[PDB]
Design a protein around this ligand. Structure first.
Ligand SMILES: [Fe+3]
Length: 823
């Protein structure tokens, strides 16, 4: 090397898959690539292959599991400034590359990527320094490298994907059915048709089943691009794999305990349910022994290691075990519960249906105004003052009621619940309509009916059951639409488009990708065990084999721009546009905790996106002229959500406003919307009576033993109506996992690396965002401490609404907003 040359001092930080000397010698080579000096073909000049020289044991700052290595690079001649590097792993086993740092002012590369043996790769792995560039700002010597890496990530739409592949592409949901196992397990393909529109998911390419060329074959592992499944230092944090263990290992063990009549088959009283988190449930030794060693699963229950499993006490009963049964809590949960985003204003009376009466029978509501306890208000007054609301599941469920009720052990109604907003600011339920389709060719004599509030006699039991029917509709809509379709499924197309079309160098890549963490991974695992034919979802929720297809019916009406919180509130008639207020909308239910708190988070995110975007885009033309951005949005819409590609409401993305709106909505769905619908699942639903997932019979007729049971044993009437004990144990277990924050969660206002960009302005903006979120949390604390807001923020269950607190410790905390759909 040159006599007065100075080698560049480098430090490589990596984590071995599972000593360290093995990484020395000729094990791992790096080659720096210049960002500023090019060869005759305009490509950045490449340095010599350089191997790790030794272990650096001097750096006190390293995360757990991390090791640092010294490396020095020759850089003589006009090599300019390094902006990327190639790395080749000659070892048999992959390692996780954390970072390269070049000293002497400092150049940082944030890699966080598995590097497999070099022979497995068609292209040498390339990593860029942490500088951010829109394509027109890419240093000329890196332009081809930047595009070639995107081409690598896209692949060619063919081939069976392997573990170490980093290939992002789309496919339809044709991998849920198991037609090769049984024709009973065949399911319609979701996506790619007018009958069944659906967001796309990540392509896996396992090829067709033997029986159906349109259904993808089963697989032991559902591929995701390698770095979408990064791994966890502590197995307890691999919550997503628990779902797989639950379906494949734990569910069969529970099933056996029932098959062997080792525990009563049904609950017989409410106390048999409360027992689950008090003394626990006694099960055969082999069930316990099957559970205890399993990572994640072992955390779900306390045990004596012999026969007892105890579930954790759900938040909803921590103060009052009977408060869930109150009409006040039933209504309050529509605004501060697990599914707080379906209630709508009702602006005429009676409520109307759009459904065809030729098919379903007369659809006129039978609810009478005179029957309603509106605290002295007339109907005209209640409508005029915007005090009438409804939870309207009539049109949503009616088209499915006949087929659901044909199933053994499922019976449902299409319900509507009328709520009145009292002057005291709380909601009260005033009627429930339990509707069934009726046509000339009907065998069933069951009738639709209206049920009114009652505290005494059989009528109180009928009303309690009516609430349960409502909540079964609500639980199904929550799990399949509010949660699954609107978060998990709707976001995946954006994750794929982002990796395919926005370089790691791209500002919008850096802005959005933290909000994707673990999403493809949980979704893949969900396709394999949760929403698959005969999987957890179908065996625990009312619609059974019709569940995921009902979500395609609802996706027909999915509107991207209506996912924006203000647009949602206005659309549902629970708020009105109001420029004189800070959020720009006035809530019609003033103390609506999800909406009130959500507006604060929404505004914080908006401010962050509005500060970040101008750092990279000066004018609308800059957005129009970004070919990566244009390709990204064109593909996300025309391929990722392609069944809806023609809808008039898609932003065109030719303006700054559009880019802000699109990023904001993506970040909102991934972080706060998902947190709000996800982390309350066990807190509210851990008591099955409060959130029944299924109903198994219609209301009994007078003159039958079932009717007499309502009089003599209302708890048993109730328990015979809702989800059976066995699916209850399985359901509770899955919602417990899903309600748990892993200790390595990255929350809103956090990033995994302080050096994700070298752009100090972006880093500053991000710090302000985090500071704002802390300020918001103090605010939400004060709200929960405000005695005037007790009625809606705490309710008779005395459960402070903390779901939109930004921060949380690990565990089942009922608070904390992750950056992404990470569980
Ligand atoms: Fe989730």
């Amino acid at each position: 090397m040159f006599s007065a040359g100075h080698k560049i001092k480098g430090t490589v930080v990596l984590m071995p898959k599972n000593n360290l000397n093995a990484f020395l010698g000729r094990s791992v080579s790096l080659q720096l690539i210049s960002a500023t000096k090019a060869d005759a073909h305009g490509k950045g000049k490449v340095g010599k292959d350089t191997f790790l020289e030794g272990i650096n044991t001097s750096l006190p700052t390293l995360g757990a599991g991390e090791s640092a290595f010294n490396i020095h690079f020759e850089w003589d001649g006009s090599m300019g400034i390094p902006g990327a590097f190639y790395i080749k792993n000659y070892m048999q086993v992959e390692f996780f590359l954390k970072s390269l740092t070049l000293e002497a002012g400092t150049i940082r590369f944030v890699c966080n990527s598995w590097v497999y043996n070099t022979k497995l790769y068609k292209s040498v792995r390339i990593f860029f320094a942490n500088h951010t560039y829109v394509p027109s700002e890419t240093p000329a010597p890196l332009v081809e490298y930047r595009e070639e890496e995107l081409k690598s990530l896209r692949g060619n739409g063919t081939g069976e994907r392997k573990e170490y592949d980093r290939i992002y592409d789309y496919d339809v949901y044709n991998d849920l059915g198991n037609p090769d196992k049984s024709e009973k397990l065949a399911r319609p393909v979701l996506g790619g048709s007018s009958t069944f529109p659906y967001p796309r998911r990540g392509r896996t390419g396992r090829g067709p089943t033997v029986t159906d060329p349109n259904t993808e074959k089963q697989g032991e592992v559902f591929y995701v691009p390698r770095d979408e499944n990064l791994g966890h230092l502590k197995s307890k944090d691999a919550l997503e794999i628990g779902t797989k263990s639950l379906s494949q290992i734990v569910q069969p063990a529970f099933e056996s305990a029932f098959d062997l009549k080792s525990t009563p088959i049904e609950f017989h009283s409410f106390q048999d349910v409360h027992d689950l988190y008090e003394g626990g449930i006694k099960l055969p030794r082999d069930v316990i022994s099957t559970i205890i060693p399993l990572p994640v699963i072992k955390e779900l229950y306390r045990t004596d290691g012999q026969h007892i499993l105890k579930f954790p006490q759900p938040h909803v009963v921590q103060v009052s075990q009977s408060a869930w049964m109150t009409d006040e809590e039933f209504a309050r949960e529509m605004i501060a519960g697990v599914n707080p985003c379906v209630i709508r204003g009702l602006e005429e009376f009676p409520p109307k249906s759009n459904l065809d009466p030729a098919i379903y029978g007369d659809q006129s509501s039978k609810i009478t105004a005179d029957s309603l306890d509106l605290d002295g208000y007339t109907m005209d007054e209640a409508l005029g003052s915007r005090r009438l609301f409804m939870l309207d599941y009539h049109d949503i469920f009616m088209p499915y009621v006949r087929q659901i009720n044909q199933l053994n052990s499922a019976k449902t109604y299409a319900t509507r619940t009328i709520l009145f907003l009292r002057e005291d600011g709380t909601l009260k339920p005033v009627a429930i309509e339990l509707s069934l389709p009726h046509s000339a060719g009907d065998l069933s004599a069951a009738v639709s009916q209206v049920v009114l509030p009652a505290k005494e006699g059989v009528e109180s039991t009928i009303w309690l059951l009516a609430k349960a029917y409502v909540i079964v509709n609500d639980s199904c809509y929550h799990q399949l639409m509010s949660h699954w379709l609107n978060t998990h499924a709707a976001m995946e197309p954006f994750v794929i488009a982002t990796h395919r079309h926005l370089s790691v160098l791209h500002p919008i890549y850096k802005l959005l990708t933290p909000h994707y963490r673990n999403n493809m991974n949980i979704n893949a695992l969900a396709r394999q065990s949760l929403i698959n034919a005969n999987g957890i979802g179908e065996t625990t929720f009312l619609p059974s084999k019709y569940s995921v297809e009902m979500s395609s019916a609802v996706y027909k009406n999915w509107v991207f721009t209506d996912q924006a919180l203000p647009a949602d509130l206005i659309k549902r008639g629970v708020a009105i546009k109001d420029p004189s207020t800070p959020h720009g909308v006035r809530l019609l239910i003033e103390d609506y905790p999800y909406a009130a708190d959500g507006l604060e988070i929404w505004a914080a995110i908006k401010t962050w996106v509005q500060e970040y975007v101008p750092l990279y885009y000066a004018r609308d033309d800059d957005v129009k002229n970004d070919s990566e951005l244009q390709h990204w949005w064109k593909e996300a819409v025309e391929k990722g959500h392609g069944d809806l590609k023609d809808k008039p409401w898609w932003p065109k993305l030719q303006t700054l406003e559009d880019l802000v709106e699109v990023c904001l909505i993506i970040i909102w769905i991934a972080s706060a919307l998902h947190a709000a619908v996800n982390f309350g699942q066990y807190p509210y639903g851990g008591l099955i009576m409060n959130r029944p997932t299924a109903s198994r019979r219609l209301l009994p007729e007078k003159g039958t033993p079932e009717y007499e049971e309502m009089i003599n044993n209302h708890e048993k009437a109730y328990l015979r109506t809702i989800t059976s004990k066995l699916p209850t144990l399985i359901s509770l277990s899955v919602i417990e996992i899903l309600s748990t924050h892993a200790s390595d969660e990255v929350y809103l206002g956090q990033r995994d690396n302080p050096h994700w960009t070298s752009d100090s302005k972006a880093l500053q903006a991000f710090q302000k965002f985090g500071n704002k979120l802390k300020e918001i949390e103090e605010k939400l604390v004060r709200r929960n401490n405000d005695p005037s807001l007790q009625g809606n923020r705490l309710g008779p269950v005395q459960l402070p609404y903390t779901l939109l607190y930004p921060s949380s410790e690990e565990g089942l905390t009922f608070r904390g907003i992750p950056n992404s759909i990470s569980i």
